[PDB]
C-alpha cells in the first residue's frame, strides 16, 4: 500500500509538517529505536486497529502507554500496557529527567495510533516545538505534528498498511 500520496490537511499549524513514510520505512524507523513507546489513543481505535496495536507491540516488543480509556480493552490482551493521560504524557515526554513508565527513563521514538487527529496534533505540538523527540504517527490520517506519518488512507488501506508494517518488523 502506498501510504505517502495523500497529505491533504483542512488547516495547517504552519510551514513545518511531518514527512510521509511508507509501511516499510516506518518499520525500519521503529526497529532502529533503542527505547520506543507505543502511545495508544481511544477515540479512533477500533477492534481491527486494536488487534494490530497488539501485534506491533509484540513483534517489536514495544511497551504501551495506554492513554484515554484504551487500557479498558488492552487489559484483557497479552501486552505490556500501563495507563497514563495523553496530555500528561505529552508534557512528561518533554522532560529529559522523566523516569518514564517503568522507571528506566525517557524514550527515543514515540509511535502514535488510535487518536482523533486534532487531539494528537495538539498533544504533539509540545514535543514538536520544545523537544528533539522523534515521533511517528501510523493513523489512517495524515498527522502534521509528528516527525513522520502515514498519509490519509481509506480504512481498508490503513489495515493493509499496518499489516505490511507488522510483516516488516
Amino acid at each position: 500500500v502506498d501510504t505517502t500520496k495523500n497529505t491533504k490537511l483542512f488547516t495547517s499549524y504552519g510551514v513545518n509538517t511531518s514527512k510521509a513514510v511508507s509501511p516499510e520505512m516506518a518499520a525500519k524507523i521503529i526497529s532502529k529505536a533503542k527505547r520506543p513507546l507505543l502511545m495508544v489513543g481511544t477515540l479512533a481505535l477500533d477492534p481491527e486497529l486494536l488487534d494490530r496495536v497488539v501485534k506491533i507491540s509484540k513483534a517489536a516488543n514495544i511497551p504501551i502507554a495506554a492513554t484515554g480509556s484504551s487500557l479498558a480493552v488492552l487489559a484483557d490482551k497479552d501486552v505490556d500496557a500501563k495507563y497514563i493521560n495523553a496530555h500528561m504524557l505529552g508534557f512528561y515526554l518533554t522532560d529529559p529527567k522523566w523516569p518514564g513508565l517503568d522507571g528506566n527513563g525517557n524514550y527515543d521514538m514515540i509511535i502514535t495510533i488510535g487518536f482523533k487527529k486534532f487531539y494528537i496534533n495538539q498533544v504533539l505540538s509540545a514535543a514538536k516545538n520544545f523537544s528533539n523527540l522523534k515521533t511517528i504517527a501510523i493513523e489512517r490520517g495524515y498527522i502534521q505534528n509528528a516527525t513522520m506519518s502515514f498519509g490519509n488512507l481509506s480504512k481498508a488501506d490503513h489495515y493493509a498498511a499496518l499489516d505490511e508494517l507488522i510483516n516488516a518488523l
Binding site: 491533504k8 490537511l9 483542512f10 499549524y13 504552519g14 510551514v15 513545518n16 489513543g41 481511544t42 477515540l43 479512533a44 495506554a66 492513554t67 484515554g68 480509556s69 487500557l71 479498558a72 488492552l74 487489559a75 484483557d76 500501563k82 495507563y83 493521560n85 495523553a86 496530555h87 500528561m88 505529552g90 508534557f91 512528561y92 522532560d95 522523566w98 523516569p99 487518536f115 482523533k116 487527529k117 486534532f118 487531539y119 495538539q122 498533544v123 505540538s125 509540545a126 516545538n129 520544545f130 490520517g141 490519509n152 480504512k155
Partner: protein, 766 residues
C-alpha cells in the same frame, strides 16, 4: 480585618499566590499554530520556541494567546452584567434589594475582590466599575511589546479568571433579584427540554442568546395576552435557562420550554419548526440569517453586539415593521427597543405560523430526495477532512447507499451541526440535512427534563455539608459545566453525572452541560433530576443556572471557607484559594468546552484551588496546568503551626488538563478530589471511589499509585483493607502488624490531625 488584596491590580496575586500555583501546576504549552499574526512586523514563525521580531518567544506568545481568550471570556460575562445592571437600575431603582434566598454571605466573589458586601442593585455599581477598569488594563497587555514572559501572562490570566467570576456573580445576582428567579431552591421546577418536546402545531418563537432582559418583555406580553398556552417559546444556549428561571421563585409551573445547547441552533433551524427567530448575544451562529431565510423564518437582532448588517427598525412603527418581515421583503431587522421587542416578536410569531404553513414548505428532503442525494456521494473524503469531529461521513454515505442508516443515525448525536462538511462537498450534498432526515425518529424522542436554574447554594446547605466536605467523608463537589463541543456525543455528561450521584458526591451543573444531563432517561423513563434531589447535598444534582451562575459554584466553595472555616473573605483571595486547594475536595468538568468564556471560567476555578478536567478539543486553548508527580520537591507545603516544611500527597495532580474519553474522565475526577487534609475516614472513602472507578473504566486493575495516598491503615478502603495491607507488604515492603492489622512502616507522609498545610508562608507561625 480585611485581607491584603482589596481592588487588586494585575500584580496583586503574582508573587504571593499565582507563582506558587504555577510552580507546582506547570504551564504545558501546546501551540494551536506555529505563528503569530498580531502586528505588521509579522507574521512571525515561532516554531521551535523561536522569538518573534518583537522579541517574544513561542511560549510567551501562547501564554499571551491563552490570556487573550481568558479576558475575552471575562469581558463577555462582564458586558452582560453591565447591561443587566444599567437596565435593571433604570427600571426598578438603585435601592432594589438583592433577594437571592436564605444566605447572609450574599456575594462571595465580589466581597473577596472588593471587600464590599452589596445588598442592593446600586451597591453593585462600584464592583462593576472595578471589573471594567481592570479589563481595560488587561486588554492593553495583549498589545505587541507588552508582557513577554509566559509565566507572567499566566499570572495575569489567573487574575482575570478571578475577575470573570466577579462579573458572572454580578450578572446573575441582579437578574435573580429583579426577575424573581429561584432563590437557592432545592425544588426548582422541572422544565421540559429537547427538540422533541415542541408542539409542532403551535406557533413557535425561538430565542437564541444570553441576555434574558428582552425575552422577559416577550413573556410579559404573552401572559398579558393569554398566549402562554397558544404558542411555544423556547430557547437555545443560556437564554433558554434564564428565561425558564423567570418569575420561578414561587415554583409556578413552567410554560416555556428549552430546545438545547448551541449544537442545536442549526439543527432546529433546519427542522423548519421556528416561525420567528430572535437573537441576542454570545454563542449565536453567524449564518442564522441566510439559513432562517431559506425556510421563511424572519430574524430579529435585539442586541447591538450582533446586528448582521440588517436594516435597523428600532425607531419604526411595529405594525409596518411586521409587514416588512411577514411579506419577506427583508430577511430580518434590528430592534433594540425592549418595549417594542416584546410585542413585535410575539405578534410576528402568531402571524407567521399560518403564513409559513400556507407556504407549503418541506424543511428536510423527502424520502426520494434523500436516497437520490446519498447516491450522488463520490466518496471523495472531503467532508471527513473538514469535519471538526472527524466523523466518517463517506462511510455513512456508503452504508446508506445500501439501506443501512445505522451509521447516520448514530452520527446525529455526535454531529455538532456546524455544516463545514457541506461547504466542501463538490456534489453539493446538504450533508447536515441528510443526517437530520435520517434522525427524525431519534429527534422525536429527544425529550427530557431539566431542573430550573436554582441559583446560589444557601448558607444552610453550606453548614450542612461544610464539615463533611473538609474531612472528605463527602467525597467532593463535582461541577459539570460548559459548552457542547464534545468529541463523542452528548450522553457523556449524563453517564458521568450518574456515576457520581450514585456514589454520593455533590453534583452541580450549569449551561449546556445542565441541558444535556437532562436529555436522557433510564429503563424506568426517569431523568437524573427526577432520580436525585436538587439540594446541595451528597447524592444531589443541582442545576445552578446559566453560565453566569458558575459564579455560585466557586461561591459555594468560598462559602465553605467563610462559613465552615470562618475565614475572612474581604480582599483575601489567596488565603481562600489556598484553603480550598488544601482542604476542599472538588473537580470541575467542561467536557465540551469551546468558548473563550469557558477558558475564563476554568481559569477562575483554578485560582481558587479548584482543578478542572476538559474535553479533548480543549487542548486547543494552548495552555494546560499539570504537575510533575515524579518530582519530590514539587510536593511540599508549610505547616502553619510551626513554619516547617511538610510533604503532601500528589493531589490534585493538575489544575487544568484534558481527558480523551468520558471513561477516562471519571476516575480522573474522583482522584482529583483527594485533599492533603482528608481525615482517615474521608481518605478511605475517596480512595474507595477512585480505586473502584479506575478498575471499572480502565481495565480492572488498581491504580498503580494508589499507595501514595496512604498515611495509616485507617486510610485504607474498609471492604478490601485486608488484601490491600497484603499488597503494601508484598509489593512495597511495608511493615505490617497482622495482630491489630495496622501499618508499622512504609508511608512517607504521616497522619497529623492538627497539621495546617498551606502554600503561604505568611500564614505560618514562625
Amino acid at each position: 480585618n480585611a485581607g491584603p488584596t482589596l481592588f487588586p491590580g494585575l500584580e496583586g496575586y503574582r508573587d504571593d499566590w499565582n507563582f506558587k500555583l504555577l510552580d507546582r501546576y506547570e504551564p504545558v504549552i501546546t501551540p494551536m499554530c506555529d505563528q503569530c499574526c498580531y502586528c505588521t512586523y509579522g507574521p512571525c514563525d515561532l516554531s521551535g520556541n523561536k522569538r518573534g521580531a518583537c522579541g517574544i518567544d513561542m511560549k510567551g506568545h501562547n501564554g499571551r494567546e491563552f490570556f487573550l481568550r481568558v479576558i475575552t471570556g471575562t469581558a463577555c460575562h462582564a458586558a452582560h452584567g453591565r447591561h443587566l445592571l444599567d437596565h435593571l437600575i433604570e427600571k426598578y431603582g438603585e435601592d432594589l434589594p438583592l433577594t437571592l434566598g436564605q444566605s447572609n454571605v450574599l456575594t462571595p466573589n465580589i466581597t473577596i475582590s472588593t471587600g464590599l458586601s452589596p445588598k442592593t442593585l446600586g451597591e453593585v455599581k462600584p464592583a462593576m466599575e472595578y471589573v471594567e477598569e481592570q479589563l481595560t488594563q488587561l486588554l492593553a497587555t495583549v498589545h505587541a511589546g507588552q508582557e513577554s514572559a509566559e509565566i507572567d501572562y499566566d499570572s495575569k490570566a489567573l487574575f482575570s479568571g478571578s475577575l470573570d467570576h466577579v462579573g458572572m456573580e454580578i450578572s446573575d445576582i441582579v437578574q435573580v433579584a429583579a426577575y424573581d428567579f429561584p432563590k437557592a431552591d432545592p425544588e426548582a421546577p422541572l422544565v421540559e427540554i429537547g427538540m422533541g418536546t415542541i408542539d409542532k402545531s403551535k406557533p413557535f418563537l425561538c430565542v437564541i442568546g444570553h441576555n434574558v432582559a428582552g425575552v422577559t418583555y416577550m413573556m410579559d406580553y404573552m401572559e398579558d395576552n393569554n398566549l402562554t398556552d397558544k404558542m411555544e417559546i423556547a430557547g437555545l444556549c443560556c437564554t433558554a435557562i434564564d428565561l425558564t428561571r423567570y418569575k420561578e421563585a414561587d415554583r409556578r409551573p413552567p410554560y416555556a420550554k428549552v430546545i438545547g445547547s448551541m449544537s442545536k441552533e442549526l439543527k432546529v433551524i433546519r427542522s423548519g419548526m421556528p416561525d420567528v427567530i430572535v437573537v441576542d448575544e454570545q454563542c449565536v451562529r453567524g449564518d442564522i440569517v441566510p439559513e432562517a431565510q431559506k425556510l421563511k423564518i424572519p430574524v430579529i437582532a435585539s442586541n447591538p453586539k450582533i446586528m448582521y448588517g440588517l436594516p435597523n427598525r428600532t425607531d419604526a412603527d411595529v405594525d409596518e415593521t411586521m409587514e416588512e418581515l411577514k411579506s419577506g421583503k427583508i430577511p430580518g431587522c434590528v430592534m433594540l427597543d425592549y418595549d417594542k421587542l416584546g410585542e413585535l416578536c410575539v405578534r410576528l410569531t402568531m402571524e407567521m405560523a399560518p403564513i409559513r404553513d400556507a407556504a407549503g414548505i418541506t424543511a428536510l428532503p423527502t424520502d426520494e430526495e434523500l436516497v437520490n442525494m446519498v447516491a450522488k456521494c463520490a466518496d471523495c473524503g472531503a467532508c471527513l477532512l473538514a469535519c471538526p469531529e472527524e466523523i466518517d461521513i463517506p462511510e455513512a454515505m456508503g452504508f446508506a447507499k445500501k439501506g443501512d442508516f445505522s451509521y447516520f443515525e448514530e452520527i446525529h448525536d455526535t454531529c455538532i451541526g456546524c455544516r463545514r462538511c457541506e461547504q466542501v462537498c463538490k456534489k453539493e450534498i446538504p450533508i447536515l440535512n441528510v443526517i437530520e432526515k435520517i434522525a427524525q425518529k431519534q429527534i422525536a424522542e429527544e425529550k427530557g427534563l431539566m431542573r430550573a436554574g436554582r441559583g446560589q447554594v444557601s448558607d444552610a446547605e453550606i453548614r450542612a455539608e461544610g464539615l463533611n466536605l473538609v474531612m472528605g467523608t463527602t467525597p467532593g463537589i463535582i461541577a459539570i459545566i460548559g459548552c457542547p463541543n464534545y468529541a463523542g456525543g452528548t450522553k457523556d455528561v449524563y453517564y458521568i453525572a450518574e456515576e457520581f450521584l450514585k456514589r454520593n458526591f455533590i453534583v452541580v451543573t450549569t449551561g449546556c452541560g445542565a441541558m444535556d444531563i437532562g436529555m436522557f432517561k433510564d429503563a424506568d423513563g426517569k431523568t437524573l433530576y427526577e432520580r436525585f434531589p436538587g439540594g446541595f447535598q451528597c447524592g444531589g444534582l443541582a442545576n445552578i443556572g446559566s453560565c453566569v451562575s458558575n459564579a455560585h459554584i466557586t461561591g459555594a466553595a468560598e462559602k465553605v471557607a467563610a462559613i465552615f472555616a470562618q475565614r475572612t473573605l474581604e480582599g483575601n483571595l489567596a488565603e481562600i484559594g489556598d484553603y480550598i486547594l488544601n482542604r476542599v475536595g472538588a473537580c470541575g468538568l467542561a467536557w465540551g468546552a469551546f468558548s473563550q468564556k469557558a477558558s475564563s471560567i476554568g481559569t477562575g476555578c483554578n485560582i481558587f484551588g479548584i482543578p478542572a478536567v476538559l474535553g479533548p478539543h480543549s487542548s486547543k486553548y494552548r495552555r494546560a496546568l499539570i504537575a510533575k508527580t515524579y518530582e519530590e520537591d514539587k510536593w511540599k507545603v508549610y505547616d502553619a503551626r510551626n513554619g516547617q516544611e511538610m510533604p503532601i500527597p500528589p493531589a490534585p495532580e493538575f489544575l487544568l488538563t484534558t481527558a480523551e474519553t468520558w471513561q477516562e474522565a471519571i476516575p480522573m475526577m474522583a482522584k482529583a478530589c483527594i485533599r492533603p487534609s482528608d481525615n482517615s475516614m474521608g481518605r478511605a472513602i475517596k480512595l474507595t471511589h477512585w480505586m473502584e472507578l479506575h478498575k471499572k473504566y480502565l481495565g480492572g486493575k488498581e491504580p498503580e499509585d494508589w499507595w501514595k495516598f496512604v498515611r495509616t491503615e485507617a486510610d485504607l478502603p474498609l471492604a478490601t483493607r485486608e488484601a490491600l495491607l497484603k499488597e503494601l507488604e508484598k509489593e512495597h515492603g511495608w511493615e505490617i502488624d497482622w495482630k491489630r492489622k495496622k501499618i508499622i512502616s512504609g508511608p512517607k507522609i504521616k497522619f497529623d490531625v492538627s497539621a495546617q498545610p498551606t502554600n503561604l508562608k505568611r500564614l505560618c507561625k514562625e
